[PDB]
Amino acid sequence: ASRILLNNGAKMPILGLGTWKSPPGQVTEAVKVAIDVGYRHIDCAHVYQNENEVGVAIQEKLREQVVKREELFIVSKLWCTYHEKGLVKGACQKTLSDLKLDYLDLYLIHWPTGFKPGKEFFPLDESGNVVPSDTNILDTWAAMEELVDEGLVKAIGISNFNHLQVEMILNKPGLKYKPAVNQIECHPYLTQEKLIQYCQSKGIVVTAYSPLGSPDRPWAKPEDPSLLEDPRIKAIAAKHNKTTAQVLIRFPMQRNLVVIPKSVTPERIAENFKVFDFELSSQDMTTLLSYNRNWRVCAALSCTSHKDYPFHEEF
């Protein structure tokens, strides 16, 4: 099953293309190729500062008659400096303009943490602490709901929200739309069993980001564990005659999750899509879930004091 049913009645492709760190000089080609080999879901963000170039590729393939707009599932996220209710529409409309689209299929609150509005995306104080904004998850959610009621986005969701933060929204008095998706980091070093259990139990679809462990993350260290080089996982890959990446992409699919591996390398974009022609066995699944080390590629120590920092909670 290539798509998963969302609570808005729309179907979301379970494999999408990540675009964080895809340089503007190379992401247009990336998206064009992805569309060419079957990707229909592209995961974007204003903060990735390549939405223009992603829109370039999309308009072109629309122009080329390769895909139609209704077949695409385009995701963007509201960056942290726009959580004020009076900034949300503009932030969404800028994304829409850059992407040269008239609606988004899914718009996520990118992180639960609101940051001080201004030009700078990740404002820190002298001391390297993030400068928060006086914004809260429920009003930002209300702002997101407006986007749906205005036709600008078909569905809204959240990202990097812990189960209590999700619950806050769910129990919102006057809730208009429940979150359709919770996009979270998820891979065999961070298997997220409890949050997944929670989300699924509440009818929220989970998207696994950084499924290859984000080797290109700008803050990586040599000592960190490296999923793609993990000999145990290469071993699993070798037994199925697949790449480690393909094992890492297949793993979340068999957990009823959406997954969004990133590449700008045409060969890998293609490689990464070829995950619907094998199955990981019960033991593979069991073995990969056992490699959980609660290790995060995305956890900003600069935000550990933000009130809405999601990763203090167990899940």
Residue 64 exposure: Cα atoms within 13 Å on the Cβ side: 12
Candidates 76, 159, 162, 192: give the one binding ligand NAP (CB under 6 A): 159
Residues 35 and 115: their CA atoms lie apart, in Å, by 34
Candidates 13, 18, 114, 188: give the one binding ligand NAP (CB under 6 A): 18
What, of ligand NAP, ligand 393, none, does residue 210 touch, CB below 5 to 8 Å by kind?
ligand NAP
Dihedral of CA 150/89/76/72: which sign? positive
Q: Which of 67, 46, 69 is nearest to 115 (CA)?
A: 46
Determine if residue 244 is labeled as part of a ligand binding site: yes
Nearer to ligand 393, 88 or 236 (CB): 88
82 is a catalytic site residue: no
Nearer to ligand NAP, 63 or 221 (CB): 221
Residues 177 and 169: their CA atoms lie apart, in Å, by 9
Which residues contact residue 140 at a Cβ distance below 8 angstroms, ignoring those fewer than 6 apart? 78, 83, 85, 88, 109, 114
List 48, 177, 198, 309, catalytic entry: 48
Q: Which of 212, 228, 229 is nearest to 297 (CA)?
A: 212
| Using rule CB under 6 A, residue 199 touches ligand NAP | no
| Using rule CB under 6 A, residue 112 touches ligand NAP | no
**Are 140 and 88 within 8 A, CB to CB?**
yes
**Are 14 and 258 within 8 A, CB to CB?**
yes
What, of ligand NAP, ligand 393, none, does residue 260 touch, CB below 5 to 8 Å by kind?
ligand NAP
- Hey, which residues does 17 pair with through a beta bridge? 42
Residues 308 and 303: their CA atoms lie apart, in Å, by 9
| Using rule CB under 6 A, residue 154 touches ligand NAP | no
What, of ligand 393, ligand NAP, none, does residue 122 touch, CB below 5 to 8 Å by kind?
ligand 393
Task: Tell me, residue by residue from 235 to 254, as one string, x for binding to ligand NAP by CB under 6 A and - for no binding.
Answer: --------x-x---------
| Using rule CB under 6 A, residue 82 touches ligand NAP | no
Candidates 263, 308, 309, 310: give the one binding ligand NAP (CB under 6 A): 263
The site for ligand NAP (CB under 6 A) is made up of 18-21, 43, 110, 159-160, 183, 209-217, 228, 243, 245, 260-265, 268, 271-272, 298
Q: Annotated binding site for NADP(+): which residue ranges?
A: 9-18, 210-272
